Structure 1
Amino acid sequence: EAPNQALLRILKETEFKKIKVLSSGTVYKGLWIPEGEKVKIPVAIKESPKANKEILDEAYVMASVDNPHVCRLLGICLTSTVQLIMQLMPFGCLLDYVREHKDNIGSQYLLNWCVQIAKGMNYLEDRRLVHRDLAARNVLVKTPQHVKITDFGLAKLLGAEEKEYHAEGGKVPIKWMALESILHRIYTHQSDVWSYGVTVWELMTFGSKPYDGIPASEISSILEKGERLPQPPICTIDVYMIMVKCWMIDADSRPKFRELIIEFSKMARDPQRYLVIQGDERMHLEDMDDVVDADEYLI
């Protein structure tokens, strides 16, 4: 179809200062001070011919997406060891965030996160991109009201009139996968819908593990036996029913992302009708002048 005219920006190593380590093949929190632009941008910096190949395929995908609910790549640095520069998401990933803040999360936020994630996913679908790794661990938290989909490591831009992706053989997350994907390694936007269902379930149980203690090999048979993840205590049947629809064996019977936006919006507009959470109405979540968030830095 259309030409991909995204720009890929190459950054000079001297344009950015690493501040502290966040993780360890080694991500830093840091600042990006482009050109002589009188801005400083908070960023996260990620720092074997297979490895380099992978990382540039990722940069390729992140470079091609532009949406308020998908992660923002600022550029790459071709230093001996390749660096990816992304928008800093100060609150980290949404799985840890619901784990660490359960006593403080109200229904309004849970439902907003579901709407935002369905918007990002609908946007990927429009771009004919299948994510293949949607999970709460792959959702970053810019602020508690603003999340973005990340981790484009398994993602696939569909070419042509390719309607599905047939994968080769790698390590792949079984507990978030559509059954067609597990059985036949086929991936569609419809199988992203299934992972969306699991992701919402992880949010609704405040971060609990799907099918905890079940080994991945059994998952296939359980699913065809017709079993699913159980209704989270906070969920009304309205919200659960939506999860279960995401888990229909017939892929075309699963809701579309665009429909998930509508359903979760309807509910977000009266949150306590749809999630029942104890204590809900009571829950709220140096040289620095030139600081500008990546979302405000458009070039």
Structure 2
Amino acid sequence: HAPNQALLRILKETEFKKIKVLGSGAFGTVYKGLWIPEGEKVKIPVAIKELREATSPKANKEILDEAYVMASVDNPHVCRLLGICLTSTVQLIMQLMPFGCLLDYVREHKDNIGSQYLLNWCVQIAKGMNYLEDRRLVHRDLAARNVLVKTPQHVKITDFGRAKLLGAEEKEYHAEGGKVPIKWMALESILHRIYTHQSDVWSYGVTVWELMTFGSKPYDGIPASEISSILEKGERLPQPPICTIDVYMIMVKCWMIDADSRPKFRELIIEFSKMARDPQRYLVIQGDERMHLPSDMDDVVDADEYLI
């Protein structure tokens, strides 16, 4: 393993300005804001998480471990952590992704989402995951809820709360126990708590299924405890109505019990790119041709153009 020379930037609180609330969770509130590094004549749209005063030492540690992972990744299809701020509670500053999570996006915009967007998103997520594989990172929580939308044309993988860096000689991560996203997990993760890049491929297949059904819940109504035996009997998620057999076969291959029989991310990039070149041959969507989606503010620059 090579040295990790990623830079962690510690921002001062007077450099960023909270504009409005975007969300509230167990761990603190998220604000829309601007990051205005002193004397640089640039304003960067950001989301700012300010942790709650009541957050435990254990929670703080876990959040900082997630920041470490996010600071260590740099790819157009993976979320961008700008830095953290050590005020009385920790604040985290990330690139603003104004269209929210992809799961919610596809549910809310399903009558205007055409085949080109769906296939491009699959390509993009596969590129991000391929990059994480190159970095020897196993995500362990890939799902449409954990993909952010910068613009309808550009998505990025997020939520590194479960991510693990494999050791140099290590091929599998062995987990301890807790509350796990069963319906996205590879069979070997459910049974034996084993995670690899190939178990992430399984989750990728489920993520694709979520997109192609415009945000349906996988195995809806089936309790999580029944999933493993359903899988062991050879049953899988059904073929979405818009999917040609070409697309469904790819998902099916992601859900092979033999981990080595599943596609690799680099191959998923290739197969979805082929399809993205002639999208209406691969996804059959009523009204496809018709569909369109969105495409002081002086000195504003996106985080992706503010390089270190």
Partners of 2:78 and 2:99 in 1: CA distance: 15
Q: Tell me, what secondary structure is at the counterpart of 2:235?
A: coil
Is 1:171 aligned with 2:174?
no
- Structure 2 residue 261 is matched with structure 1 residue 258: no
How far apart are residue 37 of structure 1 and its match? 0.7
* Alignment pair present for 1:224 and 2:232: yes
* Cα distance in 1 for residues equivalent to 2:202 and 2:19: 38
Deviations 1:220-274 (A, max 9, x none): 0000010000000000000000000000000000000000000000000000000
Post-superposition Cα deviations, 1:56-81, rounded to whole Å, max 9, x if no partner, equal: 00110000000000000000011111
Which secondary structure does the structure 2 equivalent of 1:104 belong to? coil
Distance 1:219 1:14 in 2: 49
Deviation at 1:203, TM superposition (A): 0.0
Provide, for residues 169-220 of structure 1, a one-character-per-residue CA deviation record: whole Å limited to 9, x for no partner.
1211000000000000000000000000000000000000000000000000
Shift of 1:19: 1.1
Deviation per CA, 1:3-55: give whole Å up to 9, x if none: 00000000001111111111113111111101211000000111x11110011
What does the per-residue CA deviation read over 1:123-155, in whole Å, with 9 as the maximum and x for residues that have no partner? Answer: 000000000000000000000000000000000
Task: Give CA-to-partner distance per residue, 1:260-289, whole Å, 9 cap, x none.
Answer: 000000000000000000000000109111
TM-superposed deviation, 1:166: 0.3
| Percentage of identical aligned residues | 99
Provide the C-alpha distance between the structure 1 equivalents of 2:67 and 2:121, rounded to a whole number of angstroms. Answer: 25
> Could you tell me which residue of structure 1 aligns to residue 30 of structure 2?
27
Which residue matches 1:5?
5
How many angstroms does 1:158 deviate by?
1.0
* Structure 1: distance between partners of 2:2 and 2:38: 32
Distance in 2 of aligned mates of 1:36 and 1:167: 47
| Structure 1: 4+ residue segments shifted above 2 A | none
Whether 2:138 is the aligned partner of 1:130: answer: yes
TM-score normalised according to structure 2 size: 0.96
Q: What runs of 5+ residues in structure 2 fail to find an aligned partner?
A: 50-55
SS at match of 2:111: helix
Q: Secondary structure at the match of 1:231?
A: coil
Q: Distance in 2 between matches of 1:175 and 1:119?
A: 23
Q: Distance in 2 between matches of 1:160 and 1:108?
A: 39
Structure 1: runs of 5 or more not aligned: none
Q: State the TM-score, normalized to the length of structure 1.
A: 0.99
Higher mean C-alpha deviation, range 213-222 or range 280-289: 280-289
Which is further off, 92-101 or 156-165?
156-165
In structure 2, what is the Cα distance between the partners aligned to 1:243 and 1:235? 10
2:100 equivalent in structure 1 = 92
How far apart in 1 are the matches of 2:278 and 2:217?
28
